[PDB]
Design a protein around this nucleic acid. Structure first.
Ligand SMILES: [Mg+2]
Ligand SMILES: [Mg+2]
Ligand SMILES: [Mg+2]
Ligand SMILES: [Mg+2]
Ligand SMILES: [Mg+2]
Ligand SMILES: [Mg+2]
Ligand SMILES: [Mg+2]
Ligand SMILES: [Mg+2]
Ligand SMILES: [Mg+2]
Ligand SMILES: [Mg+2]
Ligand SMILES: [Mg+2]
Ligand SMILES: [Mg+2]
Ligand SMILES: [Mg+2]
Ligand SMILES: [Mg+2]
Ligand SMILES: [Mg+2]
Ligand SMILES: [Mg+2]
Ligand SMILES: [Mg+2]
Ligand SMILES: [Mg+2]
Ligand SMILES: [Mg+2]
Ligand SMILES: [Mg+2]
Ligand SMILES: [Mg+2]
Ligand SMILES: [Mg+2]
Ligand SMILES: [Mg+2]
Ligand SMILES: [Mg+2]
Ligand SMILES: [Mg+2]
Ligand SMILES: [Mg+2]
Ligand SMILES: [Mg+2]
Ligand SMILES: [Mg+2]
Ligand SMILES: [Mg+2]
Ligand SMILES: [Mg+2]
Ligand SMILES: [Mg+2]
Ligand SMILES: [Mg+2]
Ligand SMILES: [Mg+2]
Ligand SMILES: [Mg+2]
Ligand SMILES: [Mg+2]
Ligand SMILES: [Mg+2]
Ligand SMILES: [Mg+2]
Ligand SMILES: [Mg+2]
Ligand SMILES: [Mg+2]
Ligand SMILES: [Mg+2]
Ligand SMILES: [Mg+2]
Ligand SMILES: [Mg+2]
Ligand SMILES: [Mg+2]
Ligand SMILES: [Mg+2]
Ligand SMILES: [Mg+2]
Ligand SMILES: [Mg+2]
Ligand SMILES: [Mg+2]
Ligand SMILES: [Mg+2]
Ligand SMILES: [Mg+2]
Ligand SMILES: [Mg+2]
Ligand SMILES: [Mg+2]
Ligand SMILES: [Mg+2]
Ligand SMILES: [Mg+2]
Ligand SMILES: [Mg+2]
Ligand SMILES: [Mg+2]
Ligand SMILES: [Mg+2]
Ligand SMILES: [Mg+2]
Ligand SMILES: [Mg+2]
Ligand SMILES: [Mg+2]
Ligand SMILES: [Mg+2]
Ligand SMILES: [Mg+2]
Ligand SMILES: [Mg+2]
Ligand SMILES: [Mg+2]
Ligand SMILES: [Mg+2]
Ligand SMILES: [Mg+2]
Ligand SMILES: [Mg+2]
Ligand SMILES: [Mg+2]
Ligand SMILES: [Mg+2]
Ligand SMILES: [Mg+2]
Ligand SMILES: [Mg+2]
Ligand SMILES: [Mg+2]
Ligand SMILES: [Zn+2]
Lengths: 12, 140, 204, 37, 174
RNA sequence: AAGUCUGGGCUAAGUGGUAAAGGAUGUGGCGCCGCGAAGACAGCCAG
RNA sequence: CGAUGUCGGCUCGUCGCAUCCUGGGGCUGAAGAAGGUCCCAAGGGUUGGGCUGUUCGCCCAUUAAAGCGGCACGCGAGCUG
RNA sequence: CGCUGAAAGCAUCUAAGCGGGAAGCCCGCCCCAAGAUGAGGCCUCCCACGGCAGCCGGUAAGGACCCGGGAAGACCA
């Protein structure tokens, strides 16, 4: 069930 | 004056006829004999109880519907490895394990009680192979 | 419940009734009984069998004593057939007739440290579409914090083969007593030259 | 065999039996046979 | 309003000796041993056996009647013996005695063969009638029931194996 | 660690050792109506 | 909140049973065959496709059956993105 | 689903007792396994070696090392 992602995808 | 502590004494051997006795109530007494709490010089940190030989283990008796309802249990560590064995079968297959499993759970945990359980020699059927030790017959 | 030691020699096929029959040839006989296990002496019933002639130069003194108590020449391999008590002092291929049905125990070929795809027939990962260095990998081996561990027996990579395998209900296609041969229909574990055991089948 | 929490008599021929720790209802009419559960 | 109080008439010449927890009953047809609660007293008077209960408790009252009827049946068993008749209905359905054993032809793709257990005798007077006779009451009724079960009465047709004196109750088709 | 302590009773469900409407010849115990040796109830029969 | 990476897929499973199938039953407005409904049963099984990121769902062709749920909506120091 | 059977003169698979009954349960089949420290069993082999349940040393039955290898194998085994 599509719920909003709580973390951004990690950056360098 | 510091409390008396016994040096090692010769262990007494005892014989019990388990026939017709109530499982749990015979268990406690054997545990007691094993601990050595019947000796005035009891000391909790050493093995100074009696050696206890039990005969006619298969002829132990039990109240209520436990023969069908008491479930002994063993877990192997694998998935779905919980084995349930009812009392009926345990007596039918390894009867001496009944008195053994009972008495064991009434002994203290740890190194000592673990070695006390070794001083329990239980046999199903009227004969025991310890005539050499000349065991003293106990009424309990 | 009869039995006999032997060696796998190899496979061919023969023709029986306009039909090709894949067979494995086993050099079975002759097997000298060197000890009998008895319920009074050993608590169960079995017959210790010997197999293959041995150079007595290689047989140590403990072993030599054993062979003498049976009055039997030195032998390379000892194995027991349980619940078998032959009348004779020697077992040959004669105890099986063609048409009978047998179980063969052997040592499976060893695949050494085997991957999960060969060992456990896993399906592994994709070979394109982004698959990143996991083509022959197992994937997940568990859950999360509950239970937070791996099951005993969890199928993983590791050694595979060089292990005891018994194949059952194999038809005896022929027996050639003059050469101690046994012709069994189908596949038997192990390499050619590997040791096998041939027992009467326990199937119905 | 109707299984339910409320077992009762349906007709005057129905009979309430307690059998092996359970409350059954047996009767000449097969439709009325009940066990409590 | 009471069974176990009633005395058991004991015909001649059958013997009823009392033992701890059992009674032994001999007669012109054989012997029978009746297990009896230690709590119940079995008493042997002239040509009459009586059973007495130790109190008016619910358990003892139940054991009491049961004990009597148990011993009563054992007496009648060695004297008159017990028997049940089975009636066979249906077009192809027959029975025939193959030696001591009973063969049953009741519509299956094969015939059924029933062996007499110890103390049981099968007899086939007609083709559609079967008699199970023995000195043991429960053993007879059991063997009877077993033989009936082989092809129970239908609910739609007068077909199958019946008890004698067993009502044919059916329901309509279509 | 200290009672297999004493006396009276209940429970046979391991109830004790997690739950409700409702259901029930569980068991024991107090009542309350009927109907019965002017022969009741069960039934075992004649009609 | 001096970080417990968040859907779906893939992979690998394991459990629950309120059982989709197979096994065993009672009732049926159960003739038979086939169904209905409830009870017992978790041993095994539970297919391939088209649409869409989809889970889900619809559809094709089959099937004994194409079960429903838990495991951080199991599984990103295993992959995908 | 029954047989026999009281309490409850009848009835009742149950309160005494006994049957039948599932791919399920236990055994059975295949594999691991005595670190099963509860360390099992059988067959066979060596022995009363020197000096002072211990220490050093020389052996026995045996074993390891080393080497040629192996449908055994990462090393090891
Ligand atoms: Mg004492
Ligand atoms: Mg008890
Ligand atoms: Mg044992
Ligand atoms: Mg403590
Ligand atoms: Mg030929
Ligand atoms: Mg081998
Ligand atoms: Mg290899
Ligand atoms: Mg792999
Ligand atoms: Mg494989
Ligand atoms: Mg493959
Ligand atoms: Mg694949
Ligand atoms: Mg591939
Ligand atoms: Mg792909
Ligand atoms: Mg990438
Ligand atoms: Mg990458
Ligand atoms: Mg790549
Ligand atoms: Mg992976
Ligand atoms: Mg944990
Ligand atoms: Mg290996
Ligand atoms: Mg209602
Ligand atoms: Mg009404
Ligand atoms: Mg009725
Ligand atoms: Mg008399
Ligand atoms: Mg008197
Ligand atoms: Mg119809
Ligand atoms: Mg007391
Ligand atoms: Mg309960
Ligand atoms: Mg409890
Ligand atoms: Mg509880
Ligand atoms: Mg209530
Ligand atoms: Mg009530
Ligand atoms: Mg009445
Ligand atoms: Mg946070
Ligand atoms: Mg940090
Ligand atoms: Mg931190
Ligand atoms: Mg269920
Ligand atoms: Mg079915
Ligand atoms: Mg079904
Ligand atoms: Mg039908
Ligand atoms: Mg129809
Ligand atoms: Mg049905
Ligand atoms: Mg299942
Ligand atoms: Mg499972
Ligand atoms: Mg499942
Ligand atoms: Mg496509
Ligand atoms: Mg959708
Ligand atoms: Mg179909
Ligand atoms: Mg169908
Ligand atoms: Mg699909
Ligand atoms: Mg998730
Ligand atoms: Mg999910
Ligand atoms: Mg990642
Ligand atoms: Mg993901
Ligand atoms: Mg994760
Ligand atoms: Mg995830
Ligand atoms: Mg993770
Ligand atoms: Mg993207
Ligand atoms: Mg009856
Ligand atoms: Mg009973
Ligand atoms: Mg039975
Ligand atoms: Mg039974
Ligand atoms: Mg039956
Ligand atoms: Mg099968
Ligand atoms: Mg082995
Ligand atoms: Mg060992
Ligand atoms: Mg071993
Ligand atoms: Mg242990
Ligand atoms: Mg050993
Ligand atoms: Mg042994
Ligand atoms: Mg040497
Ligand atoms: Mg090498
Ligand atoms: Zn009714």
């Amino acid at each position: 069930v599509d719920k909003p992602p709580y973390l951004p995808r990690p950056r360098p | 004056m510091k409390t008396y502590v016994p040096k090692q004494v010769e262990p007494r051997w005892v014989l019990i006829d388990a026939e017709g006795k109530t499982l749990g109530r015979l268990a406690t007494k054997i545990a007691t004999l094993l601990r050595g709490k019947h000796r005035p010089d009891w000391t909790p940190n050493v093995a100074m109880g009696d050696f206890v030989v039990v005969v006619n283990a298969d002829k132990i008796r039990v109240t209520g519907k436990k023969l069908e309802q008491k479930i002994y249990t063993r877990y192997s560590g694998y998935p779905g490895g919980l084995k349930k064995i009812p009392l009926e079968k345990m007596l039918a297959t390894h009867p001496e394990r009944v008195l053994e499993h009972a008495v064991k759970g009434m002994l203290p945990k740890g190194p000592l009680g673990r070695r006390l359980f070794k001083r329990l020699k239980v046999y199903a059927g009227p004969d025991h192979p310890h005539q050499a030790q000349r065991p003293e017959k106990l009424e309990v | 419940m009869k039995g006999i030691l032997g060696v796998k020699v190899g496979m061919t096929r023969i023709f029986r009734d306009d039909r090709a029959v894949p067979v494995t040839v086993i050099l079975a006989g002759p097997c000298p009984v060197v000890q009998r296990r008895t319920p009074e002496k050993d608590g169960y019933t079995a017959v210790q069998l010997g197999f293959l002639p041995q150079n007595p130069k290689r047989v140590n003194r403990p072993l030599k004593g054993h062979f003498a108590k049976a009055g039997v020449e030195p032998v390379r391999i000892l194995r027991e057939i349980r619940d078998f008590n032959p009348e004779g002092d020697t077992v040959t291929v004669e105890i099986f007739k063609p048409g009978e049905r047998v179980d063969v125990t052997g040592t499976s070929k060893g695949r050494g440290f085997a991957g999960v795809m060969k060992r456990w027939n896993f399906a592994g990962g994709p070979d394109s579409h982004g698959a990143h260095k996991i083509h022959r990998h197992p994937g997940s081996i568990g859950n999360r914090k509950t239970p937070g561990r791996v099951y005993k027996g969890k199928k993983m990579a590791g050694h595979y083969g060089a292990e005891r395998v018994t194949v059952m209900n194999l038809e005896v296609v022929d027996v050639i007593p003059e050469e101690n041969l046994l012709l069994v229909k189908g596949a038997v574990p192990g390499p050619n030259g590997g040791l096998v055991i041939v027992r009467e089948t326990k199937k119905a | 065999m109707k299984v339910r929490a409320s077992v009762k008599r349906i007709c005057d021929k129905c009979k309430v039996i307690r059998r092996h720790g359970r409350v059954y209802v047996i009767c000449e009419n097969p439709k009325h046979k009940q066990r409590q559960g | 309003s009471r069974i176990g109080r009633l005395p058991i008439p004991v015909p001649k010449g059958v013997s009823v000796e009392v033992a701890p927890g059992r009674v032994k009953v001999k007669g012109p047809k054989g012997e029978l041993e009746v297990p009896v609660s230690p709590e119940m007293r079995v008493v042997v008077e002239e040509g009459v056996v009586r059973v007495e209960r130790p109190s008016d408790e619910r358990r003892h009252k139940s054991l009491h009647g049961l004990t009597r009827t148990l011993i009563a049946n054992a007496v009648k068993g060695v004297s008159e013996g017990y028997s049940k008749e089975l009636l066979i209905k249906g077009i192809g359905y027959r029975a025939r005695l193959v030696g001591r054993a009973l063969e049953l032809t009741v519509g299956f793709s094969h015939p059924v063969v029933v062996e007499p257990p110890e103390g049981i005798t099968f007899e086939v007077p007609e083709p559609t009638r079967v008699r199970v006779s023995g000195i043991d009451k429960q053993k007879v009724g059991q063997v009877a029931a077993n033989i009936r079960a082989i092809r129970k009465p239908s609910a739609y047709h007068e077909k199958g194996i019946y008890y004698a004196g067993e009502p044919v109750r059916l329901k309509p088709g279509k």
